[PDB]
Amino acid sequence: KGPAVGIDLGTTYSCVGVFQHGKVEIIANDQGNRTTPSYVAFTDTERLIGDAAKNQVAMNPTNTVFDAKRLIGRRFDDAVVQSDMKHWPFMVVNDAGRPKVQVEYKGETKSFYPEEVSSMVLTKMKEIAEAYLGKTVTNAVVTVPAYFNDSQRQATKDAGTIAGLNVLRIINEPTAAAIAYGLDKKVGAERNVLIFDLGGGTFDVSILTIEDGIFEVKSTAGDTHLGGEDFDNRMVNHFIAEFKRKHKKDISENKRAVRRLRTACERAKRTLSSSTQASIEIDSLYEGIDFYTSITRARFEELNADLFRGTLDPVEKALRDAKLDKSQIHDIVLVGGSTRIPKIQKLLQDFFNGKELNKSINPDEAVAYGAAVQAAILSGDK
């Protein structure tokens, strides 16, 4: 037989892990990255998935699809879909009430249902695992947001089936993260856990009550449109202004310049989580002017101060809904790539009056990690 894997199918980044020999293994992709963008692109000659897809979005914007998780298992007439599509560069069409993404592949106009797009990403995670294990992967546990209704979960399960994956079970992301830290073990008492998940485009706060190995999602809050990308945009707008000072030029109209600057900012942002300053070196940004500059952690923090601080509002709402006080939550676990930001960790820790944060597992790998452990037990591998 082959091992069952756990897959985090995220809105912006996906991740795959496998439990083996009592240890979980987060599998890196072709480019050596431990998570891969949930991007798919269609060109004259091929279909690009993952890094290869994100690595060309500024050149092929209308045929590069992302955010499929926002469409999956949803209707076209949905207000959510109507609002969201106002910001997508690709086309979303109505087909018998179901939304479809319309792209141009090899010269021909083609359309796909959101579950078909997610299955492509699902196939990429599968081959990534297979390349590592050196054996075919069939069984898997895929995760989904706690707020997903039956249709969304059905669609997720379907994306898995068309990818050739035998979905053993669909489990909630916050639950998967708790399992990763072994907070599912029976300690003969009720345990309140807060999952603070700040990813690429989504923010989710979940309070789980665990008793005798049984999870109960007592409350959830967050923001469907708040994540790492919003932090990037603040840096971009900031550098657009700086370019205007130094070179008296407004590069705003140039879509390519902005996207290239955005990519540069996202990378600088990651450096700032471990360093106090980072350089932005972009050759021939606008016309032929090279944009060489830098940002400090201090500046990064003040550019996003309101956004970082607002991150606590949903935490308070979550608490009151669960009818719990700060002192009642026993464990806090950080999830999502953006929780690597020092100011975020300080804010949360300060709010919980100095409580220790569970963060030894890379936050952006926590969900996949939890799903892999779950996949093991459901296959008797553990």
Ligand SMILES: Nc1ncnc2c1ncn2[C@@H]1O[C@H](COP(=O)(O)OP(=O)(O)O)[C@@H](O)[C@H]1O
């Ligand atoms: N060191 C880091 N510092 C800040 N942000 C980071 C870091 N590493 C990754 N990220 C950000 O995490 C986000 C991706 O989060 P992730 O949780 O992996 O995605 P998703 O929300 O799609 O599941 C992006 O906004 C990326 O810039």
Ligand SMILES: [Mg+2]
């Ligand atoms: Mg996530």
Ligand code: NA
């Ligand atoms: Na993810």
Ligand code: NA
């Ligand atoms: Na997220």
